[PDB]
Amino acid sequence: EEIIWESLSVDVGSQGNPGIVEYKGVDTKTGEVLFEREPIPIGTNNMGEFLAIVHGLRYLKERNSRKPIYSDSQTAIKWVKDKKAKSTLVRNEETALIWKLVDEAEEWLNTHTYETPILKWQTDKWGEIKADYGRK
RNA sequence: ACAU
DNA sequence: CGATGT
Ligand SMILES: [K+]
Ligand SMILES: [Mn+2]
Ligand SMILES: [Mn+2]
Ligand SMILES: [Mn+2]
Ligand SMILES: [Mn+2]
Ligand SMILES: [Mn+2]
């Protein structure tokens, strides 16, 4: 209903799907960019959406912040809840990097706690999430 | 049918 | 038009 402006917004960006994947996190209120992941040669949109949330959790935890995280990805929000990224991406040499990062993100979830609310950004009501890359 |  | 997901 109401945007929680005191929040962190995260989003994937890509060149192809599967393709080059990156992600960033921004202050929902100001748009200030707070982190940006270096492009990963091959990944899926949903893997990046997932890594973005987990990085957000780790970022806020390190800084003792209780802000929620917004993501526009139904899939990634569920993967984080389940602590299991059920990606269909083949495991081969090409995809080894992204799969390592995803496996490690899952491992972090299974060994750490958080109270961070993970909220659905309501794109249909509010427009693009503020971490969007503007490529669509 | 919803979300990317 | 194609792909990734529940
Ligand atoms: K969107
Ligand atoms: Mn997104
Ligand atoms: Mn795994
Ligand atoms: Mn986007
Ligand atoms: Mn367009
Ligand atoms: Mn489009």
Side-chain angles (χ1 to χ4, degrees):
Chain A
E1 171 74 9
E2 197 90 344
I3 295 168
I4 296 161
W5 289 108
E6 193 178 313
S7 61
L8 173 65
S9 293
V10 300
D11 200 11
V12 74
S14 89
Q15 297 156 243
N17 186 35
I20 305 175
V21 167
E22 60 203 302
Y23 67 72
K24 60 181 159 178
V26 312
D27 190 311
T28 305
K29 180 165 37 178
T30 69
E32 180 188 1
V33 182
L34 303 177
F35 54 80
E36 270 188 307
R37 168 62 208 206
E38 169 183 304
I40 301 145
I42 298 292
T44 69
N45 63 325
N46 291 327
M47 290 168 125
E49 293 275 25
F50 171 79
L51 294 178
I53 293 174
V54 182
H55 190 79
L57 292 171
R58 298 180 71 166
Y59 176 90
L60 295 172
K61 187 176 185 76
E62 170 73 14
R63 283 164 192 65
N64 297 317
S65 179
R66 288 172 54 77
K67 292 171 177 179
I69 297 173
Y70 278 114
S71 164
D72 59 34
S73 175
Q74 185 182 115
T75 293
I77 294 174
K78 187 180 179 295
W79 286 359
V80 171
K81 182 182 188 171
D82 297 343
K83 302 186 172 195
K84 170 64 180 184
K86 257 173 58 186
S87 175
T88 72
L89 187 64
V90 61
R91 284 188 190 254
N92 64 25
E93 264 176 81
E94 260 48 83
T95 66
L97 177 50
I98 187 81
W99 265 118
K100 182 166 183 293
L101 296 170
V102 168
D103 285 341
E104 286 168 347
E106 296 171 323
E107 181 63 25
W108 189 90
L109 293 173
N110 282 315
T111 48
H112 297 77
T113 65
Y114 62 85
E115 305 189 10
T116 306
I118 301 174
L119 308 175
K120 181 66 173 72
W121 181 263
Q122 292 185 54
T123 309
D124 55 341
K125 303 183 177 75
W126 306 336
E128 295 297 324
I129 198 168
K130 271 215 179 153
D132 181 54
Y133 283 75
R135 299 156 175 184
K136 294 191 312 298

